[PDB]
Amino acid sequence: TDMSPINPELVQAVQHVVIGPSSLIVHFNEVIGRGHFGCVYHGTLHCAVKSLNVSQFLTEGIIMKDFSHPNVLSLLGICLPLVVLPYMKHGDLRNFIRNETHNPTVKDLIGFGLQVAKGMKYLASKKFVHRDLAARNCMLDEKFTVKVADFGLARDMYDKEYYSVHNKTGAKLPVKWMALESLQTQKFTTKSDVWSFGVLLWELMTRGAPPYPDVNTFDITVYLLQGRRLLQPEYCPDPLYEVMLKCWHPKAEMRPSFSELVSRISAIFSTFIGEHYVHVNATYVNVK
Ligand SMILES: O=C(Nc1cn2nc(Sc3nnc4ccccn34)ccc2n1)C1CC1
Ligand SMILES: [Cl-]
């Protein structure tokens, strides 16, 4: 790639994941939101219930139930195809930071970024590559705990705006979040998740501005290969921007591990005291 600029076994195994039919009330009248592979509804077990369009559904549930971490969205269970997830009071992280009625500080936003890094450190330790890390795909609960979501049976295209169709393969991909090598090969790794995490940090510090306005296709590759990266946000401290630049290192192997990112971001986080309010950039308001 160009990196220089130019079944009894499965049935017994799924017992601890399955929820009984009469121990789950799905409120189909109350719609939370729409995805490409299923609609999400309110439910009582209080939870979020995604109704999808069989062995793979059961298998995917077992793998997902094993992932347990405070910064990763847990699976409460499955039902037969219903995916029972914990309800996130404050919705997705992007809409939360964009909301004009919220008054985040620099500390708050770096804190959210640290939480995501902890979630990804856990997932990477399980050899799980996310492939679509972005603020829209993380969620926020009633204690403002950030949960990396949009994986396993919860995987979807929740905002169709930010997925572009590759002209040869037809795969709808989040090109603005993708590593330079993934744009060229459509292969994903933990090191490409790190690139995406860098873009997510940029989203946090811009309070949810779209990365690279008007560069929406795989021609982002040409743009990047001119020798470009996302600019430093006005309220992004210098050390955090240095971290973003490390996340976007041309060589995948030279990018920091999520372990390293948790370390570095924890240090930067600890220097702030909640005195710097982050305001939205006038040139990004209403921009898609
Ligand atoms: O909408 C609200 N709460 C809410 C919505 N969901 N949606 C899901 S489904 C799902 N899984 N991963 C993602 C990633 C991004 C979007 C959806 N995702 C799971 C829990 C949940 N809680 C509150 C009213 C603001
Ligand atoms: Cl602050």
Q: Are 113 and 261 in contact (CB under 8 A)?
A: no
Give the residues surrounding ligand 1 with Cβ less than 6 Å away: 32-33, 40, 48, 50, 73, 85, 87-88, 91-92, 137, 139, 149-150, 154, 158
Give the residues across from 34 on adjacent strands.
39
Listed residue (163, 172, 133, 165) closest to 150, CA to CA: 133
Q: Which residues of 159-181 are buried (b: 16+ CB within 10 A; e: fewer)?
A: beebbbeeeeeeeebbbbbbbbb
Structure tokens at 149: 């979501």
What is the Cα–Cα distance from 13 to 281, expressed in whole angstroms?
51
Structure resolution, Å: 1.9
Please indicate if the annotation marks 274 as binding a ligand: no
Listed residue (65, 68, 28, 64) closest to 48, CA to CA: 28
Please indicate if the annotation marks 16 as binding a ligand: no
Is residue 277 situated within a structural domain? yes
Residue of 2, 66, 108, 132 with catalytic role: 132
What is the Cα–Cα distance from 195 to 250, expressed in whole angstroms?
10
Supply the DSSP string of the chain, one letter for each residue. ---S---HHHHHHTTTTB--GGG-EEEEEEEEEEETTEEEEEEE--EEEEEE--HHHHHHHHHHHH---TTBPPP-EEE--EEEEE--TT-BHHHHHH-TT---BHHHHHHHHHHHHHHHHHHHHTT---S--SGGGEEE-TT--EEE-S-GGG---S-GGG-EE-TTT--EE-GGGS-HHHHHH----HHHHHHHHHHHHHHHHTTSPPSSTT--STTHHHHHTTT--PPPPTT--HHHHHHHHHHT-SSGGGSPPHHHHHHHHHHHHHT--S--B----TTTTT--
Is residue 2 situated within a structural domain? no
> Do both 105 and 178 map to the same domain?
yes
End position of a domain, from candidates 70, 87, 104: 87
End position of a domain, from candidates 68, 87, 106: 87
> Do both 69 and 205 map to the same domain?
no
> Do both 16 and 147 map to the same domain?
no
Is residue 192 situated within a structural domain? yes
End position of a domain, from candidates 40, 71, 87: 87
Is residue 3 situated within a structural domain? no
Is residue 1 situated within a structural domain? no
> Do both 62 and 15 map to the same domain?
yes
Instruction: Please list, in sequence order, all residues whose beta carbon lies within 8 angstroms of the beta carbon of residue 253, skipping any fewer than 6 positions away.
Output: 191
Is residue 206 situated within a structural domain? yes
Give the residues across from 42 on adjacent strands.
27, 48
> Do both 76 and 182 map to the same domain?
no
Atom number of ligand 1 nearest to Cα 149: 12
Angle at alpha carbon of residue 176, lines to 232 and 174, rounded to 5°? 145
> Do both 82 and 128 map to the same domain?
no
> Do both 55 and 178 map to the same domain?
no
> Do both 226 and 256 map to the same domain?
yes
Give the residues across from 78 on adjacent strands.
18, 83
Which protein residue's CA is at the shortest distance from atom 14 of ligand 1? 137
> Do both 13 and 41 map to the same domain?
yes
Which protein residue's CA is at the shortest distance from atom 18 of ligand 1? 150
Atom number of ligand 1 nearest to Cα 86: 20
Q: Are 31 and 39 in contact (CB under 8 A)?
A: yes
Query: Phi and psi of 94, rounded to 5°?
Result: -65, -50
What is the Cα–Cα distance from 219 to 179, expressed in whole angstroms?
13
Listed residue (132, 141, 149, 17) closest to 81, CA to CA: 17
Please indicate if the annotation marks 118 as binding a ligand: no
Query: Phi and psi of 246, rounded to 5°?
Result: -65, -40
Which protein residue's CA is at the shortest distance from atom 12 of ligand 1? 150
Question: Which structural domain range is residue 249 located in?
Answer: 88-285
Q: How far, in Å, from the CA of 91 to the mean position of ligand 1?
A: 5
Q: Are 264 and 242 in contact (CB under 8 A)?
A: no
CA dist list (Å): 96 to 63, 73, 89, 157, 219: 29, 17, 10, 18, 30
Identity of residue 123: L
Whether residue 2 lies in the annotated active site: no
Atom number of ligand 1 nearest to Cα 138: 14
Ligand nearest to the CA of 237: 2
Query: Phi and psi of 103, rounded to 5°?
Result: -125, 65
Q: At what angle do helices 258-270 and 190-205 cross, to 10 degrees?
A: 20
> What is the tally of structural domains in the chain?
2
Angle at alpha carbon of residue 106, lines to 105 and 107, rounded to 5°? 85
Question: Which residues, by Cβ under 5 Å, contact ligand 2, an ion?
Answer: 105-107, 272, 274, 276
Please indicate if the annotation marks 42 as binding a ligand: no
Sheet-wide strand order for 82-86: 25-35, 38-44, 47-52, 82-86, 77-79
Which protein residue's CA is at the shortest distance from atom 23 of ligand 1? 91
> Do both 180 and 258 map to the same domain?
yes
Is residue 4 situated within a structural domain? no
Mutate to test the pocket of ligand 1, among 88, 144, 153, 158 (most ligand atoms within 8 A of CB): 88
Ligand nearest to the CA of 90: 1
Is residue 101 situated within a structural domain? yes
> Do both 73 and 177 map to the same domain?
no
Q: Are 66 and 127 in contact (CB under 8 A)?
A: no
What is the Cα–Cα distance from 173 to 80, expressed in whole angstroms?
30
> Do both 232 and 103 map to the same domain?
yes
Ligand nearest to the CA of 141: 1
Q: What is the largest CA-CA distance in the chain?
A: 61
Please indicate if the annotation marks 31 as binding a ligand: no
